[PDB]
Design a protein around this ligand. Structure first.
Ligand SMILES: O[C@H]1CN[C@H]2Cc3c([nH]c4ccccc34)[C@@H]1C2
Length: 281
């Protein structure tokens, strides 16, 4: 049982050691498309690339490239698109991907500014009456409503395909209180946030995969998917204690490199799953 293994690693202070075994064991696949010179300005970070096999392709004939991976968890029957925070020049591509993949939710785990630097372009409208047009991808985005709570904001957006005049409702779930350094002390508000995404229907098989991002799409984004998948497998399995978080992480790392960036994020993920287990009751 992971709780016992938790106190073992804790009492022994072996978190950096576990974290390094995971690093060593992690899959390494080609990322040739990401490294083409023409894609240099489509990438926020030069050492964070989608693998070619799991990369999301835009349906534009010119350049199909976005820094985004499909994570397919076969046993849990859950898919996720993990992406970087859009750049000023990729906001149109981002919304084109949401459109093309039939996503219902966008989960954002960062602030636009952290540590005095921009982690993400402002890619959604701040007011009802000032909608955004992405001329490169022929999309219009309107803020319909905004519900600001202490730890997160939920926004209803209308995305319109200007070419076909179809419209869809997108839910923007914005976790606003992740600290600039380290991880939250308690996972209570992160679990509340995750249960809210679940309740919305955004993670359901009726819809395209949820789009999850932070700044690189690997650290906080990693923690989100790892916790969701581990909890769902504990519901599905005859023996809930057969769920090994280290195995689930390594399976997810076949689809996108670097998921979970620090031993602190690993620690926090264990804590989120341990506490989420004792919610279901
Ligand atoms: O104190 C231990 C008891 N069992 C688990 C729950 C838990 C711990 N530490 C935490 C900090 C914040 C929130 C919950 C926890 C340890 C692991």
């Amino acid at each position: 049982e992971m709780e016992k293994e938790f106190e073992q690693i804790d009492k022994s202070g072996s978190w950096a050691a576990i974290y390094q075994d995971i690093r060593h064991e992690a899959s390494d696949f080609p990322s040739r498309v990401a490294k083409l010179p023409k894609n240099k300005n489509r990438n926020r970070y030069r050492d964070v690339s989608p693998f070619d096999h799991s990369r999301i392709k835009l349906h534009q004939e010119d350049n199909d490239y976005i820094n985004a991976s499909l994570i397919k968890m076969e046993e849990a029957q859950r898919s996720y698109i993990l992406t970087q925070g859009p750049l000023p020049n990729t906001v149109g591509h981002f919304w084109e991907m949401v459109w093309e993949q039939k996503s219902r939710g966008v989960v954002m785990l960062n602030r636009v500014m952290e540590k005095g630097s921009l982690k993400c372009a402002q890619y959604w409208p701040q007011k009802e009456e000032k909608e955004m047009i992405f001329e490169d991808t022929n999309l219009k985005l309107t803020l319909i409503s905004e519900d600001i709570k202490s730890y997160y904001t939920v926004r209803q957006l209308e995305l319109e395909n200007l070419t076909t005049q179809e419209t869809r409702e997108i839910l923007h779930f914005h976790y606003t209180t992740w600290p600039d350094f380290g991880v939250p002390e308690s996972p209570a508000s992160f679990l509340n946030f995750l249960f809210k995404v679940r309740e919305s229907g955004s993670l359901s098989p009726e819809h395209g995969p949820v789009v999850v991002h932070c700044s690189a799409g690997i650290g906080r984004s990693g923690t989100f998917c790892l916790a969701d998948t581990c909890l769902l497998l504990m519901d599905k399995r005859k023996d809930p204690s057969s769920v090994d978080i280290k195995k689930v992480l390594l399976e997810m790392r076949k689809f996108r490199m670097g998921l979970i960036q620090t031993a602190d994020q690993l620690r926090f993920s264990y804590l989120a799953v341990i506490e989420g287990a004792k919610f279901i009751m």
